[PDB]
Write an enzyme that holds these catalytic residues in place. Structure first.
Site, PDB file in Angstrom:
ATOM      1  N   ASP A 180      -0.787  18.071  -7.907  1.00 23.41           N
ATOM      2  CA  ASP A 180      -1.851  17.483  -8.286  1.00 23.41           C
ATOM      3  C   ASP A 180      -2.724  18.063  -9.499  1.00 23.41           C
ATOM      4  OD1 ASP A 180      -3.947  15.437  -8.734  1.00 23.41           O
ATOM      5  OD2 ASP A 180      -4.565  14.989  -7.027  1.00 23.41           O
ATOM      6  N   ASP A 233      -2.348   9.596  -8.225  1.00 25.30           N
ATOM      7  CA  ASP A 233      -2.649   9.205  -6.641  1.00 25.30           C
ATOM      8  C   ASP A 233      -2.170   7.682  -6.513  1.00 25.30           C
ATOM      9  OD1 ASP A 233      -4.014  11.742  -6.530  1.00 25.30           O
ATOM     10  OD2 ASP A 233      -5.746  10.626  -7.611  1.00 25.30           O
ATOM     11  N   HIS A 235      -7.504  -6.513  -6.375  1.00 27.92           N
ATOM     12  CA  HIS A 235      -7.289  -6.872  -5.132  1.00 27.92           C
ATOM     13  C   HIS A 235      -6.211  -6.186  -4.424  1.00 27.92           C
ATOM     14  CE1 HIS A 235      -6.972 -10.043  -2.061  1.00 27.92           C
ATOM     15  NE2 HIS A 235      -5.823  -9.702  -2.082  1.00 27.92           N
ATOM     16  N   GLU A 236      -5.293  -5.897  -5.144  1.00 29.52           N
ATOM     17  CA  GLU A 236      -4.151  -4.923  -4.598  1.00 29.52           C
ATOM     18  C   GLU A 236      -4.521  -3.720  -4.307  1.00 29.52           C
ATOM     19  OE1 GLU A 236      -1.969  -6.404  -3.506  1.00 29.52           O
ATOM     20  OE2 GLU A 236      -2.107  -8.452  -4.548  1.00 29.52           O
ATOM     21  N   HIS A 280      -6.224  -3.390  -1.023  1.00 27.44           N
ATOM     22  CA  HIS A 280      -5.377  -3.388   0.062  1.00 27.44           C
ATOM     23  C   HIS A 280      -4.949  -2.043   0.195  1.00 27.44           C
ATOM     24  CE1 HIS A 280      -5.131  -7.489   0.928  1.00 27.44           C
ATOM     25  NE2 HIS A 280      -4.228  -7.745   0.489  1.00 27.44           N
ATOM     26  N   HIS A 297      -7.954  -8.951   4.027  1.00 29.50           N
ATOM     27  CA  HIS A 297      -8.298  -9.906   3.469  1.00 29.50           C
ATOM     28  C   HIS A 297      -9.850 -10.290   4.204  1.00 29.50           C
ATOM     29  CE1 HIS A 297      -4.404 -11.563   1.811  1.00 29.50           C
ATOM     30  NE2 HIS A 297      -4.967 -10.670   0.884  1.00 29.50           N
ATOM     31  N   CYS A 327      -7.188  13.084  -1.530  1.00 32.04           N
ATOM     32  CA  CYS A 327      -6.332  13.333  -3.072  1.00 32.04           C
ATOM     33  C   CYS A 327      -7.144  12.680  -4.330  1.00 32.04           C
ATOM     34  CB  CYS A 327      -5.027  12.616  -3.097  1.00 32.04           C
ATOM     35  SG  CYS A 327      -5.163  10.778  -3.025  1.00 32.04           S
ATOM     36  N   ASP A 384     -10.236  15.554  -7.258  1.00 34.26           N
ATOM     37  CA  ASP A 384     -10.044  16.253  -8.478  1.00 34.26           C
ATOM     38  C   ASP A 384     -10.132  15.193  -9.542  1.00 34.26           C
ATOM     39  OD1 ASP A 384      -7.405  14.593  -7.757  1.00 34.26           O
ATOM     40  OD2 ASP A 384      -6.716  16.072  -9.414  1.00 34.26           O
TER      41      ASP A 384
HETATM   42  C1  LIG Z   1       1.150 -11.450   2.745  1.00 36.44           C
HETATM   43  C2  LIG Z   1       0.424 -11.053   1.294  1.00 36.44           C
HETATM   44  C3  LIG Z   1      -0.378 -12.311   0.677  1.00 36.44           C
HETATM   45  C4  LIG Z   1      -0.541 -12.105  -0.808  1.00 36.44           C
HETATM   46  C5  LIG Z   1       0.688 -11.895  -1.342  1.00 36.44           C
HETATM   47  C6  LIG Z   1      -1.164 -13.527  -0.807  1.00 36.44           C
HETATM   48  S1  LIG Z   1      -1.286 -13.593  -2.782  1.00 36.44           S
HETATM   49  O1  LIG Z   1      -0.522 -13.284  -3.813  1.00 36.44           O
HETATM   50  O2  LIG Z   1      -1.691 -15.096  -3.163  1.00 36.44           O
HETATM   51  N1  LIG Z   1      -2.694 -13.138  -3.090  1.00 36.44           N
HETATM   52  C7  LIG Z   1      -3.938 -13.647  -2.535  1.00 36.44           C
HETATM   53  C8  LIG Z   1      -4.909 -13.973  -3.745  1.00 36.44           C
HETATM   54  C9  LIG Z   1      -5.499 -12.618  -4.506  1.00 36.44           C
HETATM   55  O3  LIG Z   1      -6.487 -12.956  -5.254  1.00 36.44           O
HETATM   56  C10 LIG Z   1      -6.732 -12.107  -6.304  1.00 36.44           C
HETATM   57  C11 LIG Z   1      -8.054 -12.535  -7.234  1.00 36.44           C
HETATM   58  C12 LIG Z   1      -9.087 -12.820  -6.659  1.00 36.44           C
HETATM   59  C13 LIG Z   1     -10.118 -13.255  -7.413  1.00 36.44           C
HETATM   60  C14 LIG Z   1      -9.840 -13.609  -8.994  1.00 36.44           C
HETATM   61 CL1  LIG Z   1     -11.022 -14.175  -9.991  1.00 36.44          CL
HETATM   62  C15 LIG Z   1      -8.437 -13.597  -9.140  1.00 36.44           C
HETATM   63  C16 LIG Z   1      -7.566 -13.304  -8.260  1.00 36.44           C
HETATM   64 CL2  LIG Z   1      -5.936 -13.247  -8.893  1.00 36.44          CL
HETATM   65  C17 LIG Z   1      -4.197 -12.114  -5.127  1.00 36.44           C
HETATM   66  C18 LIG Z   1      -2.948 -12.039  -3.996  1.00 36.44           C
HETATM   67  N2  LIG Z   1      -1.497 -10.981  -0.761  1.00 36.44           N
HETATM   68  O4  LIG Z   1      -2.834 -11.147  -0.527  1.00 36.44           O
HETATM   69  C19 LIG Z   1      -1.547 -10.018  -1.641  1.00 36.44           C
HETATM   70  O5  LIG Z   1      -2.213  -8.974  -1.606  1.00 36.44           O
HETATM   71  C20 LIG Z   1      -0.589 -10.232   1.964  1.00 36.44           C
HETATM   72  N3  LIG Z   1      -0.350  -8.679   1.264  1.00 36.44           N
HETATM   73  C21 LIG Z   1      -1.149  -7.710   1.720  1.00 36.44           C
HETATM   74  C22 LIG Z   1      -2.277  -7.794   2.717  1.00 36.44           C
HETATM   75  F1  LIG Z   1      -3.035  -7.005   2.851  1.00 36.44           F
HETATM   76  C23 LIG Z   1      -2.288  -9.233   3.156  1.00 36.44           C
HETATM   77  N4  LIG Z   1      -1.573 -10.330   3.069  1.00 36.44           N
HETATM   78 ZN   LIG Z   2      -3.929  -9.769  -0.706  1.00 38.61          ZN
END
Ligand SMILES: C[C@@H](C[C@@](C)(CS(=O)(=O)N1CCC(OCc2ccc(Cl)cc2Cl)CC1)N(O)C=O)c1ncc(F)cn1
Ligand SMILES: [Zn+2]
Ligand SMILES: [Mg+2]
Ligand code: NA
Ligand code: NI
Ligand code: NI
Ligand code: NI
Ligand code: NI
Ligand code: NI
Ligand code: NI
Ligand code: NI
Length: 282
Positions: free
Chosen positions: A89, A96, A146-147, A150, A156, A202, A205
């Site tokens: 790092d 990270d 969002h990702e 996670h 969720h 991590c 820094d």
């Molecule tokens: C099983 C997966 C479910 C998955 C792939 C569902 S998804 O791709 O449809 N998804 C849910 C909605 C989310 O919305 C983001 C968003 C929010 C506000 C606006 Cl304004 C625009 C947008 Cl874009 C994007 C990902 N999913 O959730 C992937 O993350 C799954 N994967 C990981 C988990 F922890 C749970 N489920």
């Molecule tokens: Zn999700």
């Protein structure tokens, strides 16, 4: 305490070809929106998304295998990004977390409604701190937040564990985002516990000479014609305000998303939270 999420952004061959020279500005435009979201007070934590590295895969064979299989694509990318992370790092380009962007339509087993993919609770594990994001337009900025949620251990908002705690970023399905509280109480508790338990060590820094993020609103870079192009391809354009972007395809189409903040909606006016308002605030 102040956490800094040192990030490598990666775009695949579909992105390079679709975006041309403007690809890197586009990636950092999306990421500046994500960074703003993580600075919202509702996360109840101090978190700075920063870029320390950007890779563009001009040659497919020099990148991970990207497929419609969204799960297999995350895994492929998570393996691949290890060879590009300096071991320490202390290194300037050590990151990270890593995020891949593709024009590829991502699918699960059930539908191709998939927008993005990450494992849960991986942020300080260099073999697992990864995300892949479908580039379906500026809205991908929110897929990216969002990702990363996670990645920060956020489930969720309709998960059983979120019941007594809980419209927000960690919704399982798309609908209207509460702009006054992007992050739910569940979300705050969950990233807060993750960090309190020691799984964000991590991130302490500071980055060395990080890649600078655009400070302007995204709609200042990209007009409504461009936003329609990002989502529907280069032949699309804005359909003949702010609440819903409608695009050509007289046939018109929409992914039911607003105009990006900053998007001109007349002389002296731009979009802010789906509303056409004066640029000179009273
Ligand atoms: C099983 C997966 C479910 C998955 C792939 C569902 S998804 O791709 O449809 N998804 C849910 C909605 C989310 O919305 C983001 C968003 C929010 C506000 C606006 Cl304004 C625009 C947008 Cl874009 C994007 C990902 N999913 O959730 C992937 O993350 C799954 N994967 C990981 C988990 F922890 C749970 N489920
Ligand atoms: Zn999700
Ligand atoms: Mg907004
Ligand atoms: Na998809
Ligand atoms: Ni290029
Ligand atoms: Ni730029
Ligand atoms: Ni291939
Ligand atoms: Ni709520
Ligand atoms: Ni054309
Ligand atoms: Ni127009
Ligand atoms: Ni529809």
């Amino acid at each position: 305490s102040h956490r800094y999420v040192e990030t490598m952004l990666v775009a695949d061959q579909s992105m390079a070809e679709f975006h041309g020279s403007g690809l890197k500005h586009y990636l950092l435009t999306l990421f500046s929106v994500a960074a703003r979201l993580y600075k919202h007070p509702s996360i109840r934590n101090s978190v700075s998304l920063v870029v320390v590295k950007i890779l563009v895969i001009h040659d497919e064979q020099k990148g991970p295998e990207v497929t419609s299989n969204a799960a297999l694509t995350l895994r492929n990318f998570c393996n691949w990004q290890k060879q590009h992370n300096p071991p320490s790092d202390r290194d300037a380009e050590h990151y990270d977390t890593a995020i891949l962007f593709t024009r590829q339509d991502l699918c699960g087993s059930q539908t191709c409604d998939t927008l993005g993919m990450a494992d849960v609770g991986t942020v300080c594990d260099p073999s697992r701190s990864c995300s892949v994001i479908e580039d379906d337009g500026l809205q991908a900025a929110f897929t990216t937040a969002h990702e990363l949620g996670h990645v920060f251990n956020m489930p969720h908002d309709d998960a059983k564990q979120c019941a007594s705690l809980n419209s927000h970023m960690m919704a399982s399905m798309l609908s209207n985002l509460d702009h006054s509280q992007p992050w739910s109480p569940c979300s705050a508790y969950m990233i807060t516990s993750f960090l309190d338990n020691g799984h964000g060590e991590c991130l302490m820094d500071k980055p060395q000479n990080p890649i600078q993020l655009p400070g302007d609103l995204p709609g200042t870079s990209y007009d409504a014609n461009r936003q329609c192009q990002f989502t529907f391809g280069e032949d699309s354009k804005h359909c003949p305000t702010c609440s819903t972007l409608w695009c050509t395809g007289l046939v018109c189409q929409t992914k039911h998303f607003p105009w990006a903040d900053g998007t001109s909606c007349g002389e002296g006016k731009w979009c802010i939270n789906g509303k056409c308002v004066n640029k000179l605030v009273p």
